[PDB]
Amino acid sequence: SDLEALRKKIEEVGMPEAVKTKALKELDRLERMQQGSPEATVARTYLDWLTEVPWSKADPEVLDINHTRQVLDEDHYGLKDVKERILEYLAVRQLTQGLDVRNKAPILVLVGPPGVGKTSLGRSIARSMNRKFHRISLGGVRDEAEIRGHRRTYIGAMPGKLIHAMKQVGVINPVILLDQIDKMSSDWRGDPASAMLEVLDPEQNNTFTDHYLDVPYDLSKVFFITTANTLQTIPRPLLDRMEVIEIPGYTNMEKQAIARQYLWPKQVRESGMEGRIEVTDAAILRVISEYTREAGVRGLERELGKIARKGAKFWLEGAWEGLRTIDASDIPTYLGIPRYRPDKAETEPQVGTAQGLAWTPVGGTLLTIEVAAVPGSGKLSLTGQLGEVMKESAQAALTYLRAHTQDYGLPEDFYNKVDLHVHVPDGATPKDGPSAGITMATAIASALSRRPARMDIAMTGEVSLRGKVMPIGGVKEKLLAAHQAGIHKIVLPKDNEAQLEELPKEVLEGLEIKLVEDVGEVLEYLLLPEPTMPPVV
Amino acid sequence: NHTRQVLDEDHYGLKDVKERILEYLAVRQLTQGLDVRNKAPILVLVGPPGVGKTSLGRSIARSMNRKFHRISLGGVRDEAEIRGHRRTYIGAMPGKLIHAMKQVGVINPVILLDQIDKMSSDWRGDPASAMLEVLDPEQ
Amino acid sequence: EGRIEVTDAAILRVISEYTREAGVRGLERELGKIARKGAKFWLEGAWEGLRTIDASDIPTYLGIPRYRPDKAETEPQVGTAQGLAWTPVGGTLLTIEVAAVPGSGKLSLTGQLGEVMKESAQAALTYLRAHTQDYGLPEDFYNKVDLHVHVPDGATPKDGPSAGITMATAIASALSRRPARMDIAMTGEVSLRGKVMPIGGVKEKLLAAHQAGIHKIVLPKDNEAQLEELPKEVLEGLEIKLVEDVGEVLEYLLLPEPTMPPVV
Amino acid sequence: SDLEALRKKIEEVGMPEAVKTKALKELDRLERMQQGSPEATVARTYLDWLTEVPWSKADPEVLDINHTRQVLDEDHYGLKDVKERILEYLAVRQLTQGLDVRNKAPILVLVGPPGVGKTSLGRSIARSMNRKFHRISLGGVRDEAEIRGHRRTYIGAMPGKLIHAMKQVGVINPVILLDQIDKMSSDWRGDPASAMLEVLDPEQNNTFTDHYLDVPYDLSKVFFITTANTLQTIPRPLLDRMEVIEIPGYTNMEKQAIARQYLWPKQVRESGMEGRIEVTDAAILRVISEYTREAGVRGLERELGKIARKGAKFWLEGAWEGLRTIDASDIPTYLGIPRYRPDKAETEPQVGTAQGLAWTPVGGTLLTIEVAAVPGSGKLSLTGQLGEVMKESAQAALTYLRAHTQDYGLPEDFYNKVDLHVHVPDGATPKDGPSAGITMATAIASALSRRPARMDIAMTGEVSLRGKVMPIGGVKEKLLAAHQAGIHKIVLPKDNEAQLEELPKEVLEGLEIKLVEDVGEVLEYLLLPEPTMPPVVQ
Amino acid sequence: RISLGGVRDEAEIRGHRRTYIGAMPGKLIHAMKQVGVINPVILLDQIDKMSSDWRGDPASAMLEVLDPEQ
Ligand SMILES: *[B]([O])([O])[C]([C]C1=[C][C]=[C][C]=[C]1)[N]C(=O)[C]([C]C1=[C][C]=[C][C]=[C]1)[N]C(=O)C1=[C]N=[C][C]=N1
Ligand SMILES: *[B]([O])([O])[C]([C]C1=[C][C]=[C][C]=[C]1)[N]C(=O)[C]([C]C1=[C][C]=[C][C]=[C]1)[N]C(=O)C1=[C]N=[C][C]=N1
Ligand SMILES: *[B]([O])([O])[C]([C]C1=[C][C]=[C][C]=[C]1)[N]C(=O)[C]([C]C1=[C][C]=[C][C]=[C]1)[N]C(=O)C1=[C]N=[C][C]=N1
Ligand SMILES: Nc1ncnc2c1ncn2[C@@H]1O[C@H](COP(=O)(O)OP(=O)(O)O)[C@@H](O)[C@H]1O
Ligand SMILES: Nc1ncnc2c1ncn2[C@@H]1O[C@H](COP(=O)(O)OP(=O)(O)O)[C@@H](O)[C@H]1O
């Protein structure tokens, strides 16, 4: 029957003769098996899978850097450094031309907060080379099985993703993007990363061997791109064989540009609402500042989506012909009362308040740090779900201030006559780390001093007893947030000067960066020199 | 506007939900011309068991005036559970949408699907994959 | 079929006193029970016509109140503050209580509070420790009182930081003796500065409070954005106060002249 | 062979053709296989399972009627109301069997400590309908897998609790008792309780089935009864679907009647000592009180049983001609020295101590709380193996007293000068909960006040910090245990008022209940007017 | 004395289904053969130890053997 037709099919679909041999034996050895036998079902499915996966099929594929250069420009805004870097990479892969005949595939990672376009570029490249794009995501995958699969024997047996992807793509040479590269839970039963190496070692991969199939399969052609939010969660073996591109977020201007060129028209068009609605640029700036909080734009698309969709509903009811076009005042109508309306800080300096920034893979945030000096016995209380390493920095900061009673404007006997409370809202979300060493020191002096502190400035650094600010991480991520926030007057450890080169250059003269090498200078810059409140006694 | 009427008619309360459906639909019509544009979202009506997720299906169907039929995925084990096991030589038929597909005569109807979250996965014979084929306009 | 029916408030009473879930499913059953207890009533005995249920008649239909009204004690008290909480099932109205007793600044927080909530009591105590004169507190209560903050019931476990302001209100009326109004219910987070942060689960709390029968509320500005989720009909009878700062709350709540002698 | 032959019979039993055909298929495969080879043998085992599971081999369902009422009356003493409720439940069942819908009934659970004869009530209802009877005890099951069972040719799989029971039962319509429903762990691997809903909602009840079986079993035909010692650990998805009948325990005078009418001559017949041995009515009592601290009769059954055993051994060593009867005097011969002062904890004004109640699914317990005021720095120690919430209850109770020194005339200077120790023996048993607030308010207040506290009253309430006294759990269970212990006064929060209407009159008749909404009332009621010990200091 | 130590599967207790010589009857029958007679005391040592992992659960078998009804 259709199995006889299947015999004809297997041949038509080109594949190595060993595969023919194995497959034909399977076919023959099946007939006998009486149909409906669970074994029968399983054997048949294997046959079917074997036939559907792209063995020899080809796809017209091209590589002009310049043509591709144009495309990337065609489908993305800015990212000049990031764009150029890609071609600089891509280029060398051109020399290999297969044919190096060694040293191919030092593969890519795209790193940055989510919503920064990483996958979109992937999608852009693979059309740029007029070849197929597929998304395999590796988020929190706990097992090897997922990649190299479980043997055909066991119940609910299925080939790994890698095979799954290849059937579905329909050809032997697509761009494949493995994102959530670093969201792999690891080796809790066994290492699954390994199987990846099997995937991405050029020598190794030519005969990639899934387990559900019993045929080595070849992934030699495939192009691989990876995505991640940080590199601290990749095993080193993968990590040593990657070239790193960082796409670390956009700024309100960069976002506003992106929105009108790409995000706003898609959503109008997507909505079927083309030509009946539009937003002012002024409006959009309202959407960035007051409805979203993130480094990369995957909030703006979501909100600009809400508007476009609302519009359709409205019009059919409905109340326009031609454009209703929108501006700021017209936003809460579509989108609801603003989320982040302040009014901040106010920046009119306050007593025992200092502005610190913080970051994580999903982005950098701007968080305030508050201290209260109250009369009491010298008990210190540290709330805000502070981790322990942060609590030690309170101590270091507090202890530095303790020794230098005179130099700064401190009461000389707080240590046994006041109690400090150091708080860092919000209450729920955990916070840790020592990069906000100085910033607790500035807050504490204000409290004790009674001297207000500047709240235009937002600052970062670590502190020791000696009083030396020390280098710290996440400089670009944090400073973006300052910029987005509407802060334009940073503070930084000297030894973190270097990290400024990685910043996109435009912002740099949009930011005033004081490099401090010791603590004293932070305070001086931040503390007004006449106190407001009466001292605590 | 017409479909706006029903929901008020059949379901009480739920302004927000009532709206959010409405926008899905509205945007539906506009896009209808849909070339090359319609790869439109499919709807989920997430809710804790015991607050009439299904009715809102029927409120629409009446509204859209096309037939209504429902089928329950959760506790589903077979790919051939979603298409005939085979023509002849298993004890066999075509189900589970297909037969039920001809329960209501028309080509244009509405099906609603529920407890897709709950359907059997590893136990055997994935249909969870089958569905993607099942819904995608592409094939 | 035509044998029996329920007064609509009587339904109101089944929901409230016999249901505590998000779902209908509790309801159907209860509604289920009534009907088939009609039959034993009708198998026990026959009646001609329609027997019509009012709230009071419900308890005989397998009823007892096995949940009970959150209806509140409106008259003001000293060392208490209304509060709003939220569970996946629904929104609860909880009350907070504080004690002013002779002591040495020891602070106890009981009622199975969680670490985050506890911290909310420390932030709020510390903020009041700075502004004593400003709220009419003793200049140095901190040195000569021990203080205890309780949220009954004891069995049920609690957490979250949206309570700060309620605790602060409670705490203030503890040391000052000025009674704290209990028309009003408060959900708000507090910074050590006395700023009122936004909070979560706003729909459920106010509903919980509305059904309680209090129509006066406090809430952050930041949370105003989320008053578009409550149905209007609820909103018609809601006296919301929006606050950017905690001092705005105490002035609004604490009655003008104290009622009880100081600690001694 | 007849192993072929067995094949032939397998048509006999009566699958729907669907199941029959499926069966035939697997049987063929079986033949194919090495036969005998490992998979072949497991195939045989499935085949056997599959075939011998009960398919439409029902037995005549006797009807409900008054009669079922009377089968109850002989098999148990008392339970006036419970029986009615059982009966009333069944009346409705008929109409549902009048078939307005096929079925929409609620399953039921019987809740009471161990020994109250839940497990046998159902036994004697099955008898009412002539239906076979089978018990499944569900506690303690980690895994949803036991109820559902495993894969068919996994290879390693057994079907599970329902199939075995059913298959065993051998009929289509047996009664089944799901014992200790409330003890299912619901951990990972997965949650069994969910699995039940299929079992117990008709909707799936009629279709779905064990994972080892590959075919629906109509469990609509079965009749289900449930058993639990407490309602709080039964999943609300499960709880919502049931109708509850509550069996709390027995007072001593009831316990005598169960004992003489039912448990004494049951064991006597079993021992084979019928009419050669007998026990005095006041001899049973000594058995009840001196030899058993428990809320149900399993402990009585066990010791009355001990008399027959010793009764039988003795005879064979000897003789009456003759007839032997035993009164209080002649019991410790049979059992031993008693090991219970039956009544009482000494019910006299004691300084620093109060009488509290507590409970478990196991039963209720009287419990005495002790406080010592000893001069001090202001330290609280909370011995007695008190879980956290109980300690916190002691604090909140202490605070209210701290506020109101003037009112209850405690010493104003205590908290610097006085260390309070709160203890709740026995010390080796974990105790916990807020319903003892007032009891510690009383106990502590007596300790500083120096006024004895009445101990003819037992009490339970939670003391909110204002002083309010808050409604409370397990009312019936704590009140019963207080009858048995010989305390006949109870302090109880007002808001607990409703739960009294569900007290057996028997208990209700013997008690005085004070309802308090505030905690002055307690201290006013319990505390004697003038102290009996010089104050703690100065 | 029958010894139920780590008795794993109903192969004993309940006999091997007789499709080869290698297969043999459950221990009980081995027991009843050795003692001449039908009424010998039998003691099943270590009843707690046996567990049911792979081939049915012995305990079920044991119930049948010890159930006066069946
Ligand atoms: B610092 O270590 O670079 C900084 C610590 C910090 C100080 C003050 C307020 C917030 C954070 N780190 C972060 O911002 C940390 C990440 C971290 C922690 C420890 C060591 C290195 C890096 N991020 C957060 O704590 C955070 C981020 N976003 C929201 C809330 N908290
Ligand atoms: B607040 O953070 O939104 C609030 C804290 C609270 C309010 C009133 C009384 C005690 C605590 N949180 C809650 O409502 C919490 C649940 C919660 C906690 C953290 C984050 C989100 C939500 N509510 C409770 O703890 C609780 C306890 N018992 C019954 C109902 N809710
Ligand atoms: B109360 O919560 O109903 C009560 C308080 C109490 C008083 C005296 C001794 C212990 C506890 N608790 C109990 O009844 C508890 C069980 C409990 C705990 C928390 C909430 C509800 C119920 N009972 C016991 O601890 C206990 C100990 N030993 C024997 C019997 N019960
Ligand atoms: N630089 C950019 N220019 C234009 N569009 C962008 C840019 N970055 C992101 N987007 C748009 O925002 C959406 C989210 O980007 P996405 O590809 O999901 O990024 P990531 O994969 O890093 O989350 C995409 O649909 C993309 O079109
Ligand atoms: N009220 C009663 N009247 C007569 N016999 C009873 C009564 N309560 C219990 N029994 C007997 O005592 C024994 C213990 O009851 P049991 O069914 O084990 O209780 P449980 O349901 O808690 O397991 C049973 O054998 C039963 O015959």
Coordinates of C-alpha atoms in Angstrom, one line a residue, chain D residues 50-234:
Chain D
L50 CA -8.0 -6.7 31.3
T51 CA -10.2 -9.8 31.0
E52 CA -10.9 -10.5 34.7
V53 CA -11.8 -6.9 35.6
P54 CA -15.5 -6.9 36.3
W55 CA -17.6 -6.1 33.2
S56 CA -21.4 -5.9 33.7
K57 CA -21.5 -8.8 36.2
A58 CA -23.7 -6.6 38.4
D59 CA -25.8 -8.0 41.3
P60 CA -29.4 -7.1 42.1
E61 CA -29.5 -3.6 43.6
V62 CA -31.9 -3.8 46.5
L63 CA -33.7 -0.5 46.9
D64 CA -33.5 2.2 49.6
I65 CA -36.5 2.1 51.9
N66 CA -37.3 2.4 55.6
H67 CA -35.5 -1.0 55.9
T68 CA -32.1 0.6 55.4
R69 CA -33.0 2.8 58.4
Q70 CA -33.5 -0.3 60.6
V71 CA -30.3 -2.1 59.5
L72 CA -28.6 1.0 60.9
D73 CA -30.6 0.8 64.2
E74 CA -29.3 -2.7 65.0
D75 CA -25.7 -2.1 63.9
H76 CA -25.2 1.0 66.0
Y77 CA -26.4 2.7 69.2
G78 CA -27.3 6.4 69.1
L79 CA -26.4 8.6 66.2
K80 CA -30.0 9.8 66.0
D81 CA -29.3 12.7 63.7
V82 CA -26.4 11.1 61.7
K83 CA -28.7 8.3 60.7
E84 CA -31.4 10.7 59.6
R85 CA -28.8 12.6 57.5
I86 CA -27.6 9.3 56.0
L87 CA -31.2 8.4 55.3
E88 CA -32.1 11.9 54.0
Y89 CA -29.1 11.7 51.7
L90 CA -30.4 8.4 50.3
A91 CA -34.0 9.7 49.8
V92 CA -32.8 12.3 47.3
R93 CA -30.6 9.6 45.7
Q94 CA -33.8 7.9 44.5
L95 CA -35.1 10.9 42.5
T96 CA -31.8 11.1 40.9
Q97 CA -32.4 7.4 40.2
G98 CA -35.8 8.6 39.0
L99 CA -33.3 9.8 36.3
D100 CA -34.1 13.5 35.8
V101 CA -30.4 13.5 34.7
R102 CA -28.5 10.1 34.8
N103 CA -26.7 11.4 37.9
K104 CA -25.8 14.6 39.6
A105 CA -25.4 13.5 43.3
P106 CA -22.7 14.6 45.7
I107 CA -20.4 11.9 47.3
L108 CA -20.2 12.0 51.0
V109 CA -17.6 11.9 53.7
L110 CA -18.0 10.9 57.3
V111 CA -15.7 12.8 59.7
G112 CA -14.8 11.9 63.2
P113 CA -11.8 10.8 65.2
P114 CA -10.7 7.2 64.9
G115 CA -13.0 4.6 66.6
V116 CA -16.4 6.4 66.1
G117 CA -17.4 3.8 63.5
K118 CA -17.4 5.6 60.2
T119 CA -15.7 2.6 58.6
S120 CA -18.6 0.4 59.7
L121 CA -21.5 2.7 59.0
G122 CA -20.9 2.3 55.3
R123 CA -20.4 -1.4 55.9
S124 CA -24.0 -1.5 57.2
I125 CA -25.3 0.6 54.4
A126 CA -23.9 -1.7 51.7
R127 CA -25.9 -4.4 53.6
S128 CA -29.0 -2.2 53.2
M129 CA -28.7 -2.3 49.4
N130 CA -27.3 -5.9 49.3
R131 CA -24.2 -4.6 47.5
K132 CA -20.8 -6.1 48.1
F133 CA -18.5 -4.0 50.2
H134 CA -14.8 -3.1 49.8
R135 CA -12.5 -0.8 51.6
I136 CA -9.7 1.3 50.1
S137 CA -7.5 3.3 52.5
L138 CA -6.0 6.2 50.6
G139 CA -3.5 7.6 53.1
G140 CA -0.7 8.2 52.5
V141 CA -0.2 8.5 48.7
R142 CA 2.6 10.7 47.3
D143 CA 1.7 9.9 43.8
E144 CA -1.3 10.5 41.5
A145 CA 0.2 7.4 39.8
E146 CA -1.3 4.9 42.3
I147 CA -4.9 5.8 41.5
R148 CA -4.3 6.2 37.8
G149 CA -1.6 3.5 37.5
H150 CA 1.2 3.4 34.8
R151 CA 1.8 2.7 31.1
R152 CA 0.7 -0.6 29.6
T153 CA 4.0 -2.2 28.3
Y154 CA 6.2 0.2 30.2
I155 CA 7.3 -2.5 30.9
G156 CA 7.0 -1.9 34.7
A157 CA 3.4 -1.0 35.5
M158 CA 0.6 -2.1 37.8
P159 CA -2.9 -0.7 37.4
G160 CA -3.7 0.9 40.7
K161 CA -6.1 1.2 43.6
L162 CA -9.4 1.5 41.8
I163 CA -8.8 -1.3 39.3
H164 CA -7.6 -3.8 41.9
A165 CA -10.5 -3.0 44.2
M166 CA -13.0 -3.1 41.4
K167 CA -11.6 -6.3 39.9
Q168 CA -11.3 -7.8 43.3
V169 CA -14.9 -6.8 44.1
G170 CA -16.0 -9.0 41.2
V171 CA -19.3 -7.1 40.7
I172 CA -20.1 -4.0 38.8
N173 CA -21.9 -2.0 41.5
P174 CA -20.2 -2.6 44.8
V175 CA -20.2 0.1 47.5
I176 CA -16.6 1.4 48.0
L177 CA -15.3 3.3 51.0
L178 CA -12.4 5.6 50.3
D179 CA -10.8 5.5 53.8
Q180 CA -8.6 8.4 55.0
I181 CA -9.3 10.6 52.0
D182 CA -7.8 13.5 53.9
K183 CA -4.3 11.9 54.2
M184 CA -3.3 12.0 50.5
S185 CA 0.1 13.8 50.4
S186 CA -0.5 15.5 47.0
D187 CA 3.3 16.1 46.7
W188 CA 5.3 15.4 43.6
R189 CA 5.4 13.2 41.7
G190 CA 2.0 14.7 41.0
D191 CA -1.3 15.3 42.8
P192 CA -3.5 12.2 43.2
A193 CA -6.5 14.2 44.4
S194 CA -7.0 15.6 40.9
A195 CA -7.1 12.0 39.6
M196 CA -10.1 11.4 41.9
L197 CA -12.1 14.0 40.1
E198 CA -12.2 11.9 37.1
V199 CA -13.1 9.0 39.4
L200 CA -15.7 11.0 41.3
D201 CA -17.1 13.5 38.9
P202 CA -19.6 11.5 36.9
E203 CA -18.5 13.4 33.7
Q204 CA -15.3 11.4 33.4
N205 CA -16.5 8.8 35.8
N206 CA -18.3 7.0 33.0
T207 CA -15.3 7.1 30.6
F208 CA -11.7 7.5 31.6
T209 CA -9.5 4.9 33.1
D210 CA -6.3 3.5 34.4
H211 CA -3.1 4.1 32.5
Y212 CA -2.4 0.4 32.6
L213 CA -5.8 -0.4 31.3
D214 CA -6.2 1.4 27.9
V215 CA -9.9 1.6 28.0
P216 CA -12.7 3.4 29.8
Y217 CA -14.3 1.8 32.9
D218 CA -17.8 3.0 33.7
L219 CA -17.4 3.8 37.4
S220 CA -20.8 5.5 37.3
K221 CA -22.2 2.2 38.4
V222 CA -20.2 2.1 41.6
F223 CA -21.5 3.6 44.9
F224 CA -18.9 5.7 46.9
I225 CA -18.5 6.5 50.5
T226 CA -15.6 8.4 52.0
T227 CA -13.8 8.6 55.4
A228 CA -11.8 11.4 57.0
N229 CA -10.8 12.5 60.5
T230 CA -10.7 16.2 59.5
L231 CA -12.1 18.4 56.8
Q232 CA -9.2 20.9 56.6
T233 CA -6.8 18.8 54.6
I234 CA -9.2 17.6 51.9

